[PDB]
Amino acid sequence: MYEVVRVGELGLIGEIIRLEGDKAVIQVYEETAGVRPGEPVVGTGASLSVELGPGLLTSIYDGIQRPLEVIREKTGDFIARGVTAPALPRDKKWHFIPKAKVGDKVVGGDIIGEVPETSIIVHKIMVPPGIEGEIVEIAEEGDYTIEEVIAKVKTPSGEIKELKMYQRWPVRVKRPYKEKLPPEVPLITGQRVIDTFFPQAKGGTAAIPGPFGSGKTVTQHQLAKWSDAQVVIYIGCGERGNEMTDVLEEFPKLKDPKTGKPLMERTVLIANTSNMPVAAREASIYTGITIAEYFRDMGYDVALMADSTSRWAEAYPAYLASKLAEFYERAGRVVTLGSDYRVGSVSVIGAVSPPGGDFSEPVVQNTLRVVKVFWALDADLARRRHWPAINWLTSYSLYVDAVKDWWHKNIDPEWKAMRDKAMALLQKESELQEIVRIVGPDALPERERAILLVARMLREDYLQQDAFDEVDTYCPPEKQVTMMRVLLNFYDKTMEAINRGVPLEEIAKLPVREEIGRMKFERDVSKIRSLIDKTNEQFEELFKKYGA
């Protein structure tokens, strides 16, 4: 019941112990064996690991951290496979800056040096987990290759351990930390529908529908560039045609808009393709999440974005999906290992596409059992040209209460009240739209028509957001709450007006409305805020002219 015999990594048969990984004929451990139990499987004392140090950023790997092997134009333009070579370059020289001194007491996680790895990210050099003691030797500022010993620690026993810039860690063991903090700080994405209605917490878990392209690449791309994570770990590239080919030397000119340096300078790509061994694709999320863990341990917030559609074996949702829970449970914001109090997080965003188009079973069945956020990209919205195409009735976030306090204290004391009010308004619109479908629009009283008018302005002026516009591609939190306050105040005035005999027609054509429709293009938040007063005075003129 073999896989493919002589391609890549493989899930090993055994004797009394079920799963281990190969590469070649030499096998690495998961369950500690007791060597040669069969057909020349010689074994070793090593887990499927990952190397973690200066070299990771800008790299592309397969699912077990093999560097990518290019290979020209087969499927359409490019086809790639993992070549067995060092994960981190042995020949490159890094600038090491010491951060401890001979005599310092250290623990796993303590930062003992810095390395500027790219123009964007200072890599932090940490004592590996489970090593502690006195620093007895540390390297001076200078340039070193990854294999150079940059420090030595004497453990309380007297044992001397040699520390390098990199470290190794088994991908299947969660990296330890002090404590996992409850969701509390939003991952600010700059996208209004998400930040306002379906927030993601730093350290939370979110799903978005697999890949069609109902603007999916667009919002997935907005999330990658704008979320306030310093580092992105991206798993995908497969899903073929020529995704792999547009991932190669298109990704090298994508800009990180926060610096205008290339985005690959805080990114690490793990590639899953049709031709890669099935067991390297299975392994890829553990490889990815371990790398993500390793940057949180430095105190970075990291966004792990995954996206594949993964095949089947010969040994399906039984004890599995409990193992996918595994993967998801390693998302979180933590107090890291170290002597200093320090916090980092890994937030997880996974694309999820069905047994084949139908949101019925395997993955879709209930990945939704574990994720706390679902942004339901919706082809009907894409056809109604409402972008991004996030359905505001079927999407949900379980983080609204967890994050409201950060919003209240830092941004606007009324964030959650406004959010709830706008949602109640969208919900009412939806009910009214159903009714009008049966009986038609002609008998709608003024009040109901006013609610449809204000809901349409919410949809158009707030939910819709233009990712291609130089201003509206990102919406800072302060801008979000000010736009919301403009809309809600217009709502208040609209029902007040109507409550006084002003016809709805006169409100529909108030001149401020056109200004409200363009506010998302205005970069000066104080100008947007000024629409509150301008709406008040206009309505006032209508209380004067008594409404006609």
Side-chain angles (χ1 to χ4, degrees), residues 1-34 36-69 71-548:
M1 287 158 187
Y2 331 85
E3 290 86 53
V4 65
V5 278
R6 261 145 261 107
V7 190
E9 177 213 350
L10 304 133
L12 265 88
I13 136 181
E15 195 206 331
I16 312 103
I17 49 270
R18 67 174 178 276
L19 269 308
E20 261 90 43
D22 218 307
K23 164 80 268 280
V25 207
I26 42 164
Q27 169 256 54
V28 305
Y29 264 13
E30 213 245 64
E31 294 127 330
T32 298
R36 30 265 160 176
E39 296 96 335
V41 290
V42 299
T44 201
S47 215
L48 182 58
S49 76
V50 116
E51 313 185 344
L52 308 177
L56 287 174
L57 297 182
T58 76
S59 301
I60 316 156
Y61 301 107
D62 68 352
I64 63 161
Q65 208 197 209
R66 299 188 286 213
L68 230 47
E69 226 271 52
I71 308 289
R72 48 170 175 77
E73 220 263 290
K74 290 285 283 163
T75 302
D77 205 348
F78 277 110
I79 196 156
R81 138 234 147 94
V83 58
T84 102
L88 285 3
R90 301 300 131 129
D91 58 287
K92 178 163 179 181
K93 266 188 185 154
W94 298 103
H95 190 73
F96 178 79
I97 312 186
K99 282 296 167 157
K101 68 194 161 81
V102 160
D104 288 338
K105 303 303 291 215
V106 291
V107 287
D110 270 338
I111 287 154
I112 53 164
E114 302 188 350
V115 164
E117 172 171 16
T118 72
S119 43
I120 296 175
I121 298 298
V122 178
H123 198 277
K124 310 296 197 141
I125 314 301
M126 297 174 298
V127 178
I131 289 179
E132 54 206 284
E134 204 188 84
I135 262 134
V136 296
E137 256 163 60
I138 202 169
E140 293 205 317
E141 185 163 346
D143 304 313
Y144 310 98
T145 54
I146 46 167
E147 298 280 17
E148 300 180 61
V149 171
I150 49 70
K152 303 199 178 164
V153 161
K154 208 221 260 102
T155 75
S157 219
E159 171 143 53
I160 314 276
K161 308 276 215 201
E162 302 190 319
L163 301 196
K164 301 163 156 171
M165 286 175 158
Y166 83 93
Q167 72 180 74
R168 284 193 188 81
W169 188 270
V171 310
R172 301 216 126 104
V173 178
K174 69 203 265 194
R175 305 185 111 232
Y177 48 82
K178 287 180 187 182
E179 168 187 353
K180 188 106 94 177
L181 293 166
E184 161 216 353
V185 173
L187 179 74
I188 295 298
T189 68
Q191 314 314 297
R192 286 187 284 281
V193 68
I194 291 175
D195 293 345
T196 310
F197 300 105
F198 316 110
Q200 158 84 297
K202 290 188 171 80
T205 61
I208 162 151
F212 30 57
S214 278
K216 167 235 182 266
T217 315
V218 168
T219 118
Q220 221 151 358
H221 210 133
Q222 289 284 287
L223 293 177
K225 16 196 265 104
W226 288 117
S227 305
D228 58 344
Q230 288 76 232
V231 171
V232 175
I233 307 315
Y234 189 101
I235 306 164
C237 314
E239 330 301 300
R240 93 303 157 170
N242 290 315
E243 187 176 339
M244 195 53 247
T245 102
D246 270 46
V247 157
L248 229 298
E249 249 74 357
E250 234 352 302
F251 273 46
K253 266 308 228 157
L254 311 177
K255 295 305 193 176
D256 154 55
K258 319 201 192 79
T259 66
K261 338 260 182 141
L263 179 67
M264 287 299 296
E265 286 188 16
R266 353 101 37 124
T267 305
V268 180
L269 303 188
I270 315 281
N272 297 343
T273 58
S274 311
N275 56 290
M276 281 170 189
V278 188
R281 294 187 274 120
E282 180 268 337
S284 65
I285 58 169
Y286 310 96
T287 298
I289 207 158
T290 298
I291 303 185
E293 281 169 345
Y294 167 74
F295 292 101
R296 60 132 223 253
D297 292 348
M298 310 173 198
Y300 284 130
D301 294 300
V302 1
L304 181 87
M305 308 179 49
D307 138 290
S308 311
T309 74
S310 297
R311 286 54 172 267
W312 309 284
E314 35 202 316
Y316 171 68
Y319 129 119
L320 276 152
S322 153
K323 301 304 272 56
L324 203 62
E326 193 90 308
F327 161 79
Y328 279 108
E329 161 270 321
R330 292 169 66 168
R333 198 160 64 117
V334 305
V335 171
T336 77
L337 293 187
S339 296
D340 52 309
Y341 188 81
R342 189 164 109 211
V343 189
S345 61
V346 173
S347 310
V348 181
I349 306 166
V352 181
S353 30
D358 206 73
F359 278 60
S360 152
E361 208 168 322
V363 202
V364 284
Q365 171 87 311
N366 271 318
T367 307
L368 312 185
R369 215 136 59 209
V370 198
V371 315
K372 305 231 150 32
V373 190
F374 186 55
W375 300 316
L377 260 24
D378 185 319
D380 293 325
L381 251 17
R383 283 171 279 101
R384 304 199 315 122
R385 325 201 87 122
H386 170 300
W387 311 98
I390 295 173
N391 183 318
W392 60 90
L393 269 7
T394 62
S395 290
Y396 67 87
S397 162
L398 295 180
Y399 296 132
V400 172
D401 292 300
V403 308
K404 62 194 173 196
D405 250 282
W406 181 92
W407 288 90
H408 296 337
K409 149 155 60 177
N410 301 108
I411 312 293
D412 193 312
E414 322 247 78
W415 178 80
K416 161 93 164 51
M418 289 189 150
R419 164 205 186 284
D420 292 353
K421 191 159 154 179
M423 183 62 68
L425 226 331
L426 296 164
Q427 251 136 215
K428 175 69 186 180
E429 168 188 59
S430 168
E431 299 162 17
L432 274 176
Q433 286 177 337
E434 247 302 276
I435 295 159
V436 157
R437 238 183 35 65
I438 297 150
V439 306
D442 285 303
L444 246 17
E446 288 297 78
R447 173 180 153 103
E448 311 297 327
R449 305 169 69 225
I451 287 157
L452 292 174
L453 188 249
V454 186
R456 176 173 175 161
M457 298 167 65
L458 250 178
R459 289 160 27 233
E460 296 182 343
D461 308 342
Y462 198 93
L463 280 44
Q464 296 187 196
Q465 178 160 179
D466 183 347
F468 302 75
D469 186 74
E470 66 164 65
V471 170
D472 207 40
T473 189
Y474 188 78
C475 190
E478 186 203 2
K479 182 180 171 182
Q480 298 188 27
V481 293
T482 306
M483 286 173 67
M484 187 60 82
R485 172 167 294 88
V486 164
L487 283 151
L488 293 195
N489 183 69
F490 190 95
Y491 175 78
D492 291 344
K493 307 306 266 213
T494 295
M495 309 312 277
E496 207 204 328
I498 262 175
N499 224 268
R500 313 208 330 187
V502 174
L504 178 71
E505 301 73 57
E506 208 67 292
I507 306 182
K509 61 182 142 158
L510 225 39
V512 76
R513 273 198 60 198
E514 88 85 23
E515 270 158 23
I516 305 175
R518 301 185 290 101
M519 64 185 36
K520 70 183 81 185
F521 297 117
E522 172 52 61
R523 61 190 85 217
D524 186 334
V525 179
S526 56
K527 284 178 192 181
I528 303 169
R529 188 175 294 113
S530 93
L531 302 177
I532 289 152
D533 290 346
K534 186 151 182 197
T535 299
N536 294 344
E537 22 218 64
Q538 286 185 25
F539 269 94
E540 204 46 49
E541 267 149 3
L542 227 54
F543 303 155
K544 279 195 276 86
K545 158 172 175 175
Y546 256 51

